[PDB]
């Protein structure tokens, strides 16, 4: 025989190193624990909502659904308040006290038909990002079924649970974090506000931020802090989920204002969706003014923001759009892109290319859609005439539509530009090829002898100065079945009757 003895062994994971690996290696910034906590709190809230819509018996005690963020400056304790499904004994024993395990996955195993709910917690190791900002963790939990219970662990290798005997919650869970002394600056209200606004702006619930009212016992000026900022910043309701049919202008104009900090509305809207293998909506808006980052060539563009399940992920627009279309500002909202471990970067680049093709087709069709208004189209040309020419220089698929998009200054139209098809409209039978010229200004070449021969009869010539167009004439070799003729392609042209 060759190999008679056979032995088998199961895979084991050395624990002690593993939580260290999870804490200090996976996540780029320490600005991420709050997002994870808000995510699984929202998951529990959606669990409550779904199990309550079918049966109101489950929804007892507090009907209102909300999330409270409580930073305690005096003690450094970070308190999180949610009113979700809560925990049980087995829940805290298994679903949180063991790595590589998530409750949502086991929840889908019971709901296998018509699950019209959007959860975010699939991976199962996103809870431990809290150890990045704290030394010890405290979880207050109370199910609608079982009692109140304590989760406590800080040593990394052991945990403690005990039956609660303190204030009762009745419904929901409460998260308490012992923030680290060195990184105590996270307790600043402004920092928390900015992190919430950036990473989880549209979670979809009331984020009240009802921080504890710091009691300060005593014509006289009144006190200024009746309550902390329970405004509609963390409570911003707009999720843009409404269908496009009933959508009006001003509300999405203010939506664009909020997205890009702009004071004015946008220029055009392309609200649509693509289904099948890659299901997603999208909101593309045309910025009104040119981008001033021309000097800063390789600034990381934030024009398009990618949202996965109503959660901001990445703003790297460079791999998401062709560079000749790197000025459109808007939002893409997919729902099935497979995210990596950090929920920060994508994995499938061919999916990105498919989205690229769909987006460019739709937005170039939009370019056609806005072409019917002369004033807005001349504004668009004057503002971003370069990008179409860059595409015509170095894009191959849609050169025809881009060529149709261009307009050009001519003779009989004055200083108003005209499309290449306009000259075809006034084309004469005896001429078999389009005449054009290269010149810095219209009038200087108008008197030039290179077209003075044909000026006696009053023909029309394309006037062309911007150097991209100096180099693009090779790119389009024939439009509408007629080759281009210049005073340099063949010299002084001689059109004869």
- Given the rule CB under 5 A, which of 65-73, 127-135, 191-199, 399-407 is the region that contacts Mg ion? 127-135
Lookup: tokens for 70: 């409580």
> In terms of Cα–Cα distance, which of 335, 290, 283, 288 is closest to 304?
283
Least distance between Mg ion and beta carbon 284 (Å): 31
* CA 313/CA 268 separation, integer angstroms: 25
Which of 27, 32, 48, 95 is close enough to bind ligand ATP by CB under 6 A?
95
- Residue 349 marked in a binding site: no
345 binds, among a copy of itself, ligand ATP, Mg ion, none (CB under 5 to 8 A by kind): a copy of itself
Q: Does 84 bind ligand ATP (CB under 6 A)?
A: yes
> In terms of Cα–Cα distance, which of 260, 290, 310, 274 is closest to 46?
310
* CA 351/CA 419 separation, integer angstroms: 36
- Residue 55 marked in a binding site: no
82 binds, among ligand ATP, a copy of itself, Mg ion, none (CB under 5 to 8 A by kind): ligand ATP
- Residue 47 marked in a binding site: yes
Least distance between a copy of itself and beta carbon 46 (Å): 22
Contact in structure between 179 and 76 (CB atoms under 8 Å):
yes
Q: Does 36 bind ligand ATP (CB under 6 A)?
A: yes
Q: Does 127 bind Mg ion (CB under 5 A)?
A: yes
Q: Does 439 bind ligand ATP (CB under 6 A)?
A: no
- Residue 295 marked in a binding site: no
Q: Does 122 bind ligand ATP (CB under 6 A)?
A: yes
Q: How far is CA 335 from the centre of its chain?
A: 12
- Given the rule CB under 6 A, which of 57-65, 90-98, 258-266, 277-285 is the region that contacts ligand ATP? 90-98
Least distance between Mg ion and beta carbon 96 (Å): 8
Handedness of CA 133, 134, 139, 140 (dihedral sign): negative
Q: Does 3 bind a copy of itself (CB under 8 A)?
A: yes
Binding mask 148-187 for ligand ATP (x = CB under 6 A): -------------------------x--------------
Q: Does 206 bind ligand ATP (CB under 6 A)?
A: no
* CA 376/CA 367 separation, integer angstroms: 11
Which of 108, 244, 345, 424 is close enough to bind a copy of itself by CB under 8 A?
345
- Residue 344 marked in a binding site: no
Q: Which is nearer to ligand ATP, 126 or 391 (CB)?
A: 126
* CA 202/CA 236 separation, integer angstroms: 7
- Residue 82 marked in a binding site: yes
* CA 71/CA 80 separation, integer angstroms: 8
* CA 100/CA 125 separation, integer angstroms: 6
Contact in structure between 120 and 137 (CB atoms under 8 Å):
no
Contact in structure between 485 and 434 (CB atoms under 8 Å):
yes
Q: Which is nearer to Mg ion, 107 or 127 (CB)?
A: 127
- Residue 235 marked in a binding site: no
Binding mask 283-322 for a copy of itself (x = CB under 8 A): ------------xxxx-xx----------------x----
* CA 491/CA 421 separation, integer angstroms: 24
Q: Does 308 bind ligand ATP (CB under 6 A)?
A: no
> In terms of Cα–Cα distance, which of 267, 94, 86 is closest to 171?
86
Which of 71, 84, 86, 126 is close enough to bind Mg ion by CB under 5 A?
126
Binding mask 40-59 for ligand ATP (x = CB under 6 A): xx-xx---------------
Q: Does 287 bind Mg ion (CB under 5 A)?
A: no
Q: What is the DSSP letter of 137?
A: E
Which of 121, 206, 287, 391 is close enough to bind Mg ion by CB under 5 A?
121
> In terms of Cα–Cα distance, which of 46, 37, 48, 105 is closest to 70?
37
Contact in structure between 237 and 204 (CB atoms under 8 Å):
no
- Residue 87 marked in a binding site: yes
Q: Which residue's structure tokens are 């992190």?
A: 195
Q: Which is nearer to ligand ATP, 36 or 460 (CB)?
A: 36
How are beta strands 172-179 and 482-485 bridged, if at all? unpaired
Q: Dihedrals φ, ψ of 283, to 5°?
A: -130, 105
Contact in structure between 464 and 470 (CB atoms under 8 Å):
yes
Least distance between a copy of itself and beta carbon 104 (Å): 12
Which of 69, 70, 79, 126 is close enough to bind ligand ATP by CB under 6 A?
126
Least distance between a copy of itself and beta carbon 178 (Å): 18
Distances (CA, A) of 497 to 46, 80, 411, 453: 79, 86, 21, 14
Q: What is the DSSP letter of 95?
A: I
Distances (CA, A) of 137 to 18, 50, 150, 236, 356: 18, 29, 10, 29, 44
Q: Which is nearer to ligand ATP, 91 or 333 (CB)?
A: 91
Distances (CA, A) of 241 to 272, 277, 282, 381, 450: 12, 20, 10, 32, 59
Q: Does 39 bind ligand ATP (CB under 6 A)?
A: yes
Please state the residue numbers annotated as binding site for ATP: 36, 40, 47, 82, 87, 95, 101-104, 122-127, 173, 343
Please state the residue numbers annotated as binding site.
Answer: 36, 40, 47, 82, 87, 95, 101-104, 122-127, 173, 343
Q: Which residues are at the interface with a copy of itself (CB under 8 A)?
A: 2-15, 17-19, 21, 24-29, 93, 97-101, 123-125, 150, 157-166, 295-298, 300-301, 318, 323, 338, 340-341, 345-347, 349, 390, 468
- Residues of the binding site for Mg(2+): 36, 40
């Amino acid at each position: 025989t060759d190999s008679g003895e056979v032995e088998t062994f199961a895979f084991q994971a050395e624990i002690a190193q593993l939580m260290s690996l999870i804490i200090n290696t996976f996540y780029s910034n320490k600005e991420i624990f709050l997002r994870e906590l808000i995510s699984n709190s929202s998951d529990a809230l959606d669990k409550i909502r779904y199990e309550s819509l079918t049966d109101p018996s489950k929804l007892d005690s507090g009907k209102e659904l909300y999330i409270k963020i409580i930073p305690n400056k005096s003690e450094g304790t970070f308190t999180i308040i949610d009113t979700g499904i809560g925990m049980t004994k087995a829940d805290l024993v298994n679903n949180l006290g063991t790595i590589a395990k998530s409750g949502t996955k086991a929840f889908m195993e019971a709901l296998q038909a018509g699950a019209d709910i959007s959860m975010i917690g699939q991976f199962g190791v996103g809870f431990y990002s809290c150890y990045l900002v704290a030394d010890r963790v405290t979880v207050h939990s109370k199910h609608n079924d079982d009692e109140q219970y304590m989760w406590e662990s800080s040593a990394g290798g052991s945990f403690t649970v005990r039956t609660d005997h303190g204030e009762p919650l009745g419904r929901g869970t409460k998260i308490v974090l012992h923030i680290k002394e060195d990184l105590a600056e996270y307790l600043e209200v402004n920092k928390i506000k900015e992190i919430v606004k950036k990473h989880s702006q549209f979670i979809g619930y009331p984020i009240k931020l009802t921080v504890e009212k710091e009691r300060e016992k005593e014509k006289k000026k009144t006190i200024k802090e009746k309550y902390t900022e329970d405004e509609e910043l963390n409570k911003t309701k707009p999720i843009w989920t409404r269908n496009a049919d009933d959508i009006t202008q001003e509300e999405y104009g203010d939506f664009y204002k909020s997205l890009t900090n702009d004071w004015e509305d946008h220029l055009a809207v392309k609200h649509f969706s693509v289904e099948g293998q890659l299901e997603f909506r999208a909101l593309l808006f045309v910025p009104r003014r040119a981008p001033f980052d021309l000097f800063e060539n390789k600034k990381r563009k934030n024009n398009i923001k990618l949202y996965v399940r109503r959660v901001f992920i990445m703003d790297n627009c460079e791999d998401l759009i062709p560079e000749y279309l790197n000025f459109i500002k808007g939002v893409v909202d997919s729902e099935d892109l497979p995210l990596n471990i950090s929920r920060e970067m994508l994995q499938q680049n061919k999916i990105l290319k498919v989205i690229r093709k769909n987006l460019v087709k739709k937005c170039l069709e939009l370019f056609e859609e806005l072409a019917e208004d002369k004033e807005n189209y001349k504004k668009y040309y004057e503002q971003f005439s370069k990008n179409l020419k860059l595409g015509i220089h170095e894009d191959a698929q849609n050169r025809t539509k881009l060529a149709d998009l261009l307009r050009y200054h001519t003779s009989a139209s004055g200083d108003e530009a005209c499309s290449l098809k306009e000259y075809v409209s006034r084309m004469k039978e005896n001429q078999k090829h389009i005449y054009y010229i290269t010149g810095e200004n219209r009038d200087q070449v108008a008197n030039s002898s290179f077209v003075e021969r044909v000026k006696k009869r009053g023909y029309e010539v394309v006037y062309m100065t911007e150097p991209i167009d100096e180099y693009v004439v090779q790119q389009m070799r024939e439009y509408d079945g007629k080759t281009l003729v210049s005073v340099t392609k063949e010299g002084l042209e001689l059109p004869e009757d």
